[PDB]
Design a binder for this molecule. Structure first.
Ligand SMILES: O=C(O)c1cccc(Cl)c1
Length: 167
């Protein structure tokens, strides 16, 4: 049993809810929240901007030190940093950004990072401002992640379309 409430069950391991991911993290304090990161960990907008704002910019300060030491992530890659006031840990995952021309086949590699964690609160990778089709992102999620994932969909309209169209 876990703390997640109000989710629709899609599969054995994947759950979905219409929710602001910043508000869900604050309520649950999950072990892992996933950030929709870029390779520079520049948390300017979208999920990243919202998560970072909720940490009062402490996520960005920590991230800048990580990049200064390690250099940029890979598209499809990830790193584990603090969850600050939102979670124990933040898994920063880089899905491909279609608005930068990145290979959508890297979306599966991105989701494979989730398999290193038994339970996660996450957004749909490469969705929102990243430019990919969220229906496709949900399909890749279900067909890639084997650990227990609780997906937070920001738009109510999109949430209802993802559920209604789910095979
Ligand atoms: O695209 C999203 O899921 C998103 C974008 C910005 C803020 C939030 Cl809470 C969510």
């Amino acid at each position: 049993v876990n703390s997640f409430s109000g989710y629709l069950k899609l599969t054995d391991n994947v759950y979905i809810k219409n929710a602001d991911i910043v508000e869900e993290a604050k309520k649950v304090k999950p072990t892992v929240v996933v950030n929709a990161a870029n390779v520079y960990l520049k948390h300017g907008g979208g999920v990243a901007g919202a998560l970072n704002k909720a940490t009062n910019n402490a996520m960005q300060v920590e991230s800048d030190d990580y990049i200064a030491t390690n250099g940029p992530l890979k598209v499809g890659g990830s790193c584990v940093l603090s969850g600050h006031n939102l979670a124990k840990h933040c898994l920063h995952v880089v899905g491909p950004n279609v608005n930068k021309g990145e290979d959508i086949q890297l979306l599966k590699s991105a989701y494979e990072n989730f398999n290193q964690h038994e339970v996660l609160l996450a957004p749909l990778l490469s969705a929102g401002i990243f430019g990919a089709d969220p229906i496709h992102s949900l399909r890749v999620c279900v067909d890639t992640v084997r650990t227990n994932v609780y997906l937070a969909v920001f738009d109510k309209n999109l949430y209802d379309k993802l559920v209604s169209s789910f095979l």
